[PDB]
Amino acid sequence: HAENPLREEEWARLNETVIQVARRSLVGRRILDIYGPLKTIPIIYKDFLLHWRDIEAARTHNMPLDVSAAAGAAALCAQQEDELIFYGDARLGYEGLMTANGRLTVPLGDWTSPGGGFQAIVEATRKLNEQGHFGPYAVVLSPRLYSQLHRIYEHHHVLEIETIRQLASDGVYQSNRLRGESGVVVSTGRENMDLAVSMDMVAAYLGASRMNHPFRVLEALLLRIKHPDAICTLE
Amino acid sequence: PDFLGHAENPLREEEWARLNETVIQVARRSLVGRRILDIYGPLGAGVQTVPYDEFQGETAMVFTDARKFKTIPIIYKDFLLHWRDIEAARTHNMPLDVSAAAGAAALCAQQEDELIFYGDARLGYEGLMTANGRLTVPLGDWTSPGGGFQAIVEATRKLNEQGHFGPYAVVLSPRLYSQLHRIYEHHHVLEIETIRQLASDGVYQSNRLRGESGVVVSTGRENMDLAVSMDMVAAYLGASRMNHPFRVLEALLLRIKHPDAICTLE
Amino acid sequence: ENPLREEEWARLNETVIQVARRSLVGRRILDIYGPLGAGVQTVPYDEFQGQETAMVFTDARKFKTIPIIYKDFLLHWRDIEAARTHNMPLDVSAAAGAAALCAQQEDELIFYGDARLGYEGLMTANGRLTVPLGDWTSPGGGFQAIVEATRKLNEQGHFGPYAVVLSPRLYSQLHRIYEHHHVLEIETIRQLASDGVYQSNRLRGESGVVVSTGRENMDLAVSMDMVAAYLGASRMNHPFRVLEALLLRIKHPDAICTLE
């Protein structure tokens, strides 16, 4: 009975798997600047379990350990983090980018006809430029609008996504946490908004319950919106 | 000399290295399944059974694991070498001819892809295109531009409705893959690229797929992987008469853990 | 007896090799079996297959002799002395011309063989597959031709990756610029031939070939790579020769498709 059922190499391969899985499924960290690592700070976590006979076989038979449950937990944690970033938490009195008070709004418009999305983005950028924030811009869209921007038409000679990217030098991305037809344009920069991270996504041992081994993947972060006028939501 | 008596090793170290390198190089360039799946292993040739599910958890108690186990099959192909050829290679200082090993490795790779994509119902194995519990979308019409884009969009939406968010990989039959590369007037863009911004894990073609068919998979280690016990290798079977038989072989298995992460184009 | 030293010989051989490499097309789509040595003169053509009187066993494979391709050039003694005294490097243009002619001969032999000596080529093999050429002036003709060729090759169990070799006229026609098209067909064709699309000047008229690569289908048996040799002393001149010896082996004729 000890507080470390894993060796050093197994720990390294579990932690690198967690980091690698978290890296490829995060969208909110690609438009924000990280202020850390270091008002209540929320904690996001997900648990998984390991069988003791599997560890005994891995160490005795000289075979690699299976780390799929950690990958699943990390994917769920990344989904939770994106949900918190985009929509916040009403129970804790937290606001996201899509619900911040004092943000500008524009009508979504007709997107079926070619050029509608470009007109909407231009109108949002125009309203943003009126309030003193002028570039660089980043655009986040729901899967429906993102797929609709990739339609192929005749005599257009260019994909509308590149026409949009001409304006949004930071980038245009798709997010699954957005519901229905939704989009957001943000003026990037640490002076407008940022993310304060207290503890990165890491795995921790909880102690042996019965004879099996529980582990938890967890992290702690907060979103600080200093200027609410640098966000324009399509609705 | 060295052929007048029974011997355990007819080749020297350099030619064993060259043969194994040839086998590996031939194997790597003709495998499509390994470009979209994670690898669990190598586990060792002594491992013959592997779990299929994920671990969940007055008198005495009896505990029995609820996971399902399965045996790992072997894929192999044989070839033969002439003894005078080896004698001439050693005596005249000539490189040895290793084409038969390349042919055997190509056949083994084809068999591996066939097992991965369609399985084997006689032995109880399932493939990506025959799994039970997978999703399905109509194929539609791919003669006009935009049909493939619409089909992929519909498949991605149905995958998203079940909590699988990507990134996605697409595998197509040669006919659909060729149709995706056609050229039309005023369009100025190929539909393959437009599809490629929707599947960030890649779009591939496989000759194992039949007629007009395709599969979209939400990649992830927790959804599916490949359990490998032994990669392709060459072994000496022992001299029969005076010639030398060899075998190229491998052992692996496909594990489908979430069947609803697959969408086939029907 | 030889009018050159180690460094001059090395420079001559280096120039010959560099001229040879840049101009050889068939060596970019074929595997090499060798070098085997200058003493090897015969090579097998097929793959090996396994009382009161003694037994007699004979091999069932076929064998062929390896030919030699060569070209002669000259070097003058006064220029050698001037280079040695001045220390300026020698003039080696004749060797480059000889190497270019040898490369042309090798490419012609690979692509068309020699009917008199019973040597086959890719364009004249017996048992190969053929597809109609169609009309390459309008867009899509080359794409359709390559798609048909690859489909017919796939029907016989050869899955690629494929390589395409074309005559100059077809290569030029796959580079035209039409009105509101903005996409070159050569890129689309290159996206289907994973091993490459190449241009060859030995191909006659409008023609092309699609091959499925692999040592088990075809390779090149090289006994001696291109090299230079001294022929002796004649008056004051110094004759030299550039020569090589190699052969092409076709094992599966149905892995080749020609564009009729």
Q: What is the DSSP string of B43-66?
A: --TT--EEE-S-------------
Please tell me the distance from the alpha carbon of residue A110 to that of residue C245, in angstroms, as a whole number: 72
End-to-end CA distance of chain A: 58
User: Nearest C-alpha of chain C: how many angstroms from A154?
Assistant: 10
Name all domains of chain B by residue range, CATH numbers in brackets.
13-127+224-257 (3.30.2400.30), 135-218 (3.30.2320.10)
Query: Which class for B68: exposed (0-12), middle (13-18), buried (19 or more C-beta within 10 A)?
Result: exposed
A150 at C interface, C-beta within 8 A: no
Of chain C, the end-to-end C-alpha distance in Å amounts to 55
* Close Cβ partners of C251 (under 8 Å, ≥ 6 residues apart): B99, C46, C47, C216, C217, C218
Distance CA B118, CA B113 (A): 8
Q: How far apart (Å, rounded) are the C-alpha atoms in residues B45 and A218?
A: 37
- At B224, which amino acid appears? M
CA B10 to CA A235: how far, in whole Å? Answer: 76
Alpha helices for chain A (secondary structure H): 8-23, 52-61, 68-87, 116-130, 143-148, 160-167
**How far is it, in rounded angstroms, from Cα A110 to Cα A199?**
43
Calpha distance B234→B81 (Å, rounded)? 13
CA distance A184 to A228: 13
Question: What is the dihedral sign for C-alpha B9, B12, B16, B22?
Answer: negative
CB B200 within 8 A of CB B167: yes
DSSP conformation letters of A161-208: HHHHHHH-SSEEEE-SSS-SS-EEEEE-STTTEEEEEEEEEEEEE---
CB B195 within 8 A of CB B172: no
* 8 Å CB contact between B169 and B156: no
Q: Does A1 touch chain B (CB under 8 A)?
A: no
DSSP C85-124: HH-PPPP-HHHHHHHHHHHHHHHHHHHH-BTTTTB--TTT
Distance CA B186, CA B183 (A): 10
Phi then psi for A129, rounded to 5 degrees?
-65, -20
Structure determination technique employed: cryo-EM
- Segments of A23-125 assigned E as strands: 43-50, 104-106
Report which DSSP code applies to A29: G
* Positive or negative torsion for Cα A22, A23, A28, A33: positive
- Cβ contact C194:C26 at 8 Å: no
What residue has token string 């038969």?
A: B100
Structure tokens at B113: 């892809």
User: Cis before residue C161, ω within 30 degrees of 0?
Assistant: yes
Resolution in A: 2.7
Residue in the structure block whose two tokens are 């690859």: C150
With beta carbons under 8 A apart, name residues in chain C contacting B192.
191
User: Rounded CA gap, B210 and B233, in Å?
Assistant: 30
In the DSSP assignment, the letter for residue C140 is: T
Burial B82-91 (b: 16+ CB within 10 A, else e): beebbeebbe
Q: Does C216 touch chain B (CB under 8 A)?
A: yes
A69 and B222 in contact by Cβ < 8 A? yes
Q: Which of C33, C40, C143 sits opposite B97 (nearest CB)?
A: C33
Cβ–Cβ under 8 Å, residues B263 and B100: no
Check residue B222 and report its DSSP letter: T
The CA distance from C184 to the nearest CA of chain A, in Å, is 15
Closest CA to A147 of A171, A168, A117: A117
Is A228 in contact with A100 (CB distance < 8 Å)? Answer: yes
C-alpha to C-alpha distance for C104 and C111, rounded to whole angstroms: 11
Q: Are C36 and C223 in contact (CB under 8 A)?
A: yes
Is C25 in contact with C109 (CB distance < 8 Å)?
no
Whether the CB-CB separation of A235 and A107 falls below 8 Å is answered with yes
Residue C145: count other Cβ atoms within 10 Å of its Cβ.
24
Which partners does chain C have (≥3 C-beta pairs < 8 Å)? Answer: A, B
* Phi (first) and psi of residue A200, to 5 degrees: -70, 170
Q: How far is B202 from chain C (nearest CA, A)?
A: 14
Q: Which residue carries 């291109």 as its tokens?
A: C226
The residue count of chain A comes to 235
Tell me how many degrees the CA angle A59-A65-A69 measures, rounded to the nearest 5.
Answer: 140
The neighbour count for residue B246, using CB atoms within 10 Å, is: 20
Q: Are strands B203-205 and C42-44 parallel, antiparallel or unpaired?
A: unpaired
Cα–Cα distance, C244 to C106 (Å, whole number)? 9
Output the DSSP codes for C229-256: EE---BTTBEEEEEEEEEEEEES-GGGE
Q: Could you give the dihedral angle defined by the CA atoms of residues C154, C155, C158 and C164, in that order, rounded to the nearest 10 degrees?
A: -50
- Residue A58 is classified by DSSP as H
**Under a CB-based contact definition with an 8 Å cutoff, are residues B70 and B258 in contact?**
no
Q: Which among A159, A158, A161 has a CA at the least distance from the CA of A139?
A: A161
- State which amino acid sits at residue C215: R
Query: Closest Cα partner for B200 from B36, B38, B39?
Result: B36
How far apart are the C-alpha atoms of B59 and B64, rounded to whole Å?
17
The length of chain B is 266
Q: State whether residue B106 sits within 8 Å of chain C by CB.
A: yes
Interface test with C, best of B78, B81, B183, B208 (most C CBs within 10 A): B183
Q: How many Cβ atoms from other residues are within 10 Å of residue B66's Cβ?
A: 9
DSSP letter for each residue of C202-223: SS-SS-EEEEE--TTTEEEEEE
d(CA A13, CA A65): 9
Task: Enumerate residues 6+ apart whose C-beta is below 8 A from C181.
Answer: B183, B185, B188, C139
HSE-up (13 A, CA, CB side) for residue B133? 8
- Of B54, B82, B81, nearest to B66 by C-alpha is B54
DSSP state of A54: H
The strand pairing partners of B203, in sequence order, are: B170
Residue B233 — φ and ψ, nearest 5°?
-150, 160
Please report the residues numbered 151 through 190 in chain C whose beta carbons come closer than 8 angstroms to any beta carbon of chain A: 180, 182
Preceding amide of C132 cis, omega within 30:
no
Please list the residues that pair with C187 across neighbouring strands. none
CA angle B84, C67, C232 (to 5 degrees): 115
- Which structure tokens are listed for B40? 């669990």
Structure token digits, residue A229: 């006028």
| Alpha-carbon gap, residue A225 to A227, rounded angstroms | 6
Phi-psi region of A219 (alpha: psi -120 to 50; beta: other; left: phi over 0): beta
Nearest 5°: phi and psi at B48? -115, -15
Helix or strand run (H / E) with residue B124: none
Q: For residue B204, what are the CA distances in angstroms to B60, B111, B177, B186, B200?
A: 55, 18, 8, 27, 12
